[PDB]
């Protein structure tokens, strides 16, 4: 990402770019998004939350007018839009704000209302883990034994994000889809479930819990989840394909390199602190450098698709290249798709062109599994 | 507030509206905002040369991508790349002067990419040719071969080809189980290139499509966008085979729209006016305007007897909102089933032709029409 869409504040512009990308799949048009953004001063998180929260209100009011005619199709779309409008506001909401969980629950209710009015068979689930239950969504046809795709996010996602990132598209290509929030993600920190050293357990928990029609099970990790899935894929062999955007074998090194008045960055860092369960982002970083353990990628044997943008930290691209070179040497079926700027998909997690990366992923996955 | 109310990327208002419109197309089909903003990053504000070049080289880029991909036979992806390429070319065409040898060259390249995109998808769209005045009007159709579906005829204005009509409403018509016809009238698409220029009354041309079409049912609706809001008014005022009228926006007095509109350094408007003169078949846009002022006949809207839906943005010229209100009030006193939908700024759909939120506009159109037709 290195020219602006709307804001000079880089964090805000990236978020804005990302919110636009979502609208390509479900929810708000570029029209709504520029309308909302016209009320947002550059680098002002308070304006951001206010405008996005108000748009959600407008949309719920629309739902109430249109109900009076049971325009079913339309009600689902408005509910999705309202949901992702609250999601946008949440991105820059401080966990210490009383509004935070109120709004997080409001987002969740709206997501289910969109699904209630849709012809999508999505259901809420809870995966048992470490005494507690991890929140997730699942979409599974009752009548067909389909191959499964599990979607895992990074440090800025909830199960709702996993939906438009891959899960919905996965379902539309006839896969059973699970999208579960691991500790540290979504609202897990709110119940004492913070980022943990090894994601293998949580991910195996999900598989332990899932009674899979077929054995053809793929896992896809975005952002942070490129590290979490690397971890699962190393040790757990019922995973039959691995998609990572981007794959990470050593987070310690990613942090080390990265972190060697911006009110937007401040709220971001605070949310991270909350997800790690620490008092500082600074302390959180140390926790990582401290405990995060390097994946033994020479132990990965699975068909792999690595997705990486040209607007991507050079350390992320390095680790991607390492894994590519190593898997190729060893004759693992590996593909490294670089997304150039021209492609319009070069931003982290391919948010600036979800549609393209969906085609890439599923053309590849169809080949690996069906074929 | 001529075509929209909020600035997106460019200070030049014509270019900014076109850009908004190109973004909107991507919500339906083809390019992402990511692609569009990358492209735009290489365009100087109000420079239609930069615009044409960036968009043309983006199509070159996508077509190589397609080749690169053929080696693995990804249809869905290939089809998607062709659509993006097609509409990338279409974007460049918008600010291409038709006295350019590359105008028709690129126009045909667009049509080809459109067909290659369709051939790699599951949409059973066909290219058709409607007989009229001893010539043939290019169009597209999507028809069911077994099912007897109601029909939707889509009509554009001064800046559309068959191709635009597809995303604009036609493909949606299809997703909603209507038979769809998208036909370029004289003055539209490639028609001026074969000596078919804007004519005084669009009724004969629309009527020819109806003569040509063999309708599975008698439920036939017509939708007009921009200047098509006038063309379809002329038709609906005379031809009773039309059972429903959607207009964005409805126009009964086009001369007035012109007078009021046009009572240099803007190279964008300038090229676009040149395109108009070409469409009208006159030596320049001024002669063209005079032609309208002295020949365009006011529609006798008091004679219109059809369920009507008018779609108008809060971001639109007050003159078009005015004509829409006049019709609404007339139809309403006369007991016509008429609906006037104003799209607020907040809806994100308040630009001319609802380009900034096509999706919302599609919901509104097909919920209404299903109600009128069931
Ligand atoms: Mg590329
Ligand atoms: Mg509105």
mmCIF file of C-alpha atoms in Angstrom, chain A residues 3-5 20 23-32 34-35 38 55 58 62 71-74 77-78 173 337 340-344 352-353 355-356 359-360 363-364, chain B residues 6-9 23 26-35 37-38 41 58 61 65 74-77 80-81 176 341 344-348 356-357 359-360 363 367-368:
data_model
loop_
_atom_site.group_PDB
_atom_site.id
_atom_site.type_symbol
_atom_site.label_atom_id
_atom_site.label_comp_id
_atom_site.label_asym_id
_atom_site.label_seq_id
_atom_site.Cartn_x
_atom_site.Cartn_y
_atom_site.Cartn_z
ATOM 1 C CA UNK A 3 -0.371 5.971 -2.343
ATOM 2 C CA UNK A 4 -3.428 7.239 -0.512
ATOM 3 C CA UNK A 5 -7.115 6.576 -1.016
ATOM 4 C CA UNK A 20 -13.811 -0.325 0.816
ATOM 5 C CA UNK A 23 -17.964 -3.578 0.155
ATOM 6 C CA UNK A 24 -16.867 -5.406 -2.944
ATOM 7 C CA UNK A 25 -18.149 -8.614 -1.302
ATOM 8 C CA UNK A 26 -21.020 -7.607 1.016
ATOM 9 C CA UNK A 27 -22.386 -4.463 2.551
ATOM 10 C CA UNK A 28 -21.583 -0.875 1.884
ATOM 11 C CA UNK A 29 -20.938 0.690 -1.491
ATOM 12 C CA UNK A 30 -18.058 3.002 -2.165
ATOM 13 C CA UNK A 31 -20.792 5.653 -2.148
ATOM 14 C CA UNK A 32 -21.730 5.040 1.470
ATOM 15 C CA UNK A 34 -17.090 8.191 0.905
ATOM 16 C CA UNK A 35 -20.233 9.732 2.372
ATOM 17 C CA UNK A 38 -16.617 13.101 4.383
ATOM 18 C CA UNK A 55 -24.359 5.147 9.567
ATOM 19 C CA UNK A 58 -29.411 5.070 9.610
ATOM 20 C CA UNK A 62 -34.008 1.743 6.881
ATOM 21 C CA UNK A 71 -38.295 -6.836 0.866
ATOM 22 C CA UNK A 72 -36.405 -9.903 2.055
ATOM 23 C CA UNK A 73 -33.363 -9.577 -0.205
ATOM 24 C CA UNK A 74 -32.898 -5.960 0.846
ATOM 25 C CA UNK A 77 -28.064 -6.452 2.687
ATOM 26 C CA UNK A 78 -28.875 -3.533 4.987
ATOM 27 C CA UNK A 173 -17.499 -22.860 -3.984
ATOM 28 C CA UNK A 337 1.537 -15.796 -5.810
ATOM 29 C CA UNK A 340 1.650 -6.491 -7.799
ATOM 30 C CA UNK A 341 0.296 -2.977 -7.397
ATOM 31 C CA UNK A 342 -1.284 -3.130 -10.858
ATOM 32 C CA UNK A 343 -3.238 -6.161 -9.719
ATOM 33 C CA UNK A 344 -4.937 -3.911 -7.185
ATOM 34 C CA UNK A 352 -7.928 -3.955 -1.873
ATOM 35 C CA UNK A 353 -9.033 -6.797 -4.167
ATOM 36 C CA UNK A 355 -12.428 -10.889 -5.480
ATOM 37 C CA UNK A 356 -9.098 -11.530 -7.204
ATOM 38 C CA UNK A 359 -10.377 -16.644 -7.542
ATOM 39 C CA UNK A 360 -6.723 -17.396 -6.957
ATOM 40 C CA UNK A 363 -8.888 -22.130 -8.586
ATOM 41 C CA UNK A 364 -5.856 -23.501 -6.714
ATOM 42 C CA UNK B 6 -19.307 14.599 -2.624
ATOM 43 C CA UNK B 7 -15.756 14.692 -4.056
ATOM 44 C CA UNK B 8 -14.094 11.265 -4.487
ATOM 45 C CA UNK B 9 -10.646 11.773 -6.063
ATOM 46 C CA UNK B 23 -15.809 2.521 -9.057
ATOM 47 C CA UNK B 26 -16.700 -2.637 -9.975
ATOM 48 C CA UNK B 27 -19.217 -3.270 -7.259
ATOM 49 C CA UNK B 28 -21.134 -5.273 -9.844
ATOM 50 C CA UNK B 29 -18.401 -6.591 -12.013
ATOM 51 C CA UNK B 30 -14.747 -6.273 -12.932
ATOM 52 C CA UNK B 31 -12.231 -4.005 -11.270
ATOM 53 C CA UNK B 32 -11.798 -3.415 -7.528
ATOM 54 C CA UNK B 33 -11.323 -0.071 -5.861
ATOM 55 C CA UNK B 34 -7.745 -1.227 -5.436
ATOM 56 C CA UNK B 35 -7.255 -1.404 -9.180
ATOM 57 C CA UNK B 37 -7.107 3.916 -7.268
ATOM 58 C CA UNK B 38 -3.842 2.443 -8.549
ATOM 59 C CA UNK B 41 -2.683 7.483 -9.117
ATOM 60 C CA UNK B 58 -4.338 -1.370 -17.509
ATOM 61 C CA UNK B 61 -1.844 -5.552 -18.257
ATOM 62 C CA UNK B 65 -2.599 -11.797 -17.104
ATOM 63 C CA UNK B 74 -9.199 -21.170 -14.658
ATOM 64 C CA UNK B 75 -12.540 -20.115 -16.389
ATOM 65 C CA UNK B 76 -14.037 -18.115 -13.520
ATOM 66 C CA UNK B 77 -10.822 -16.140 -13.149
ATOM 67 C CA UNK B 80 -13.244 -12.046 -14.447
ATOM 68 C CA UNK B 81 -10.029 -10.756 -16.035
ATOM 69 C CA UNK B 176 -34.046 -11.830 -11.094
ATOM 70 C CA UNK B 341 -37.617 7.378 -4.984
ATOM 71 C CA UNK B 344 -30.303 10.486 0.044
ATOM 72 C CA UNK B 345 -26.583 11.192 0.312
ATOM 73 C CA UNK B 346 -26.594 8.860 3.256
ATOM 74 C CA UNK B 347 -27.794 6.003 1.095
ATOM 75 C CA UNK B 348 -24.592 6.396 -0.926
ATOM 76 C CA UNK B 356 -22.298 5.174 -6.429
ATOM 77 C CA UNK B 357 -24.566 2.401 -5.244
ATOM 78 C CA UNK B 359 -26.732 -2.546 -5.693
ATOM 79 C CA UNK B 360 -29.179 -0.522 -3.669
ATOM 80 C CA UNK B 363 -33.016 -3.826 -4.927
ATOM 81 C CA UNK B 367 -38.790 -5.266 -5.630
ATOM 82 C CA UNK B 368 -41.020 -2.686 -7.245
#
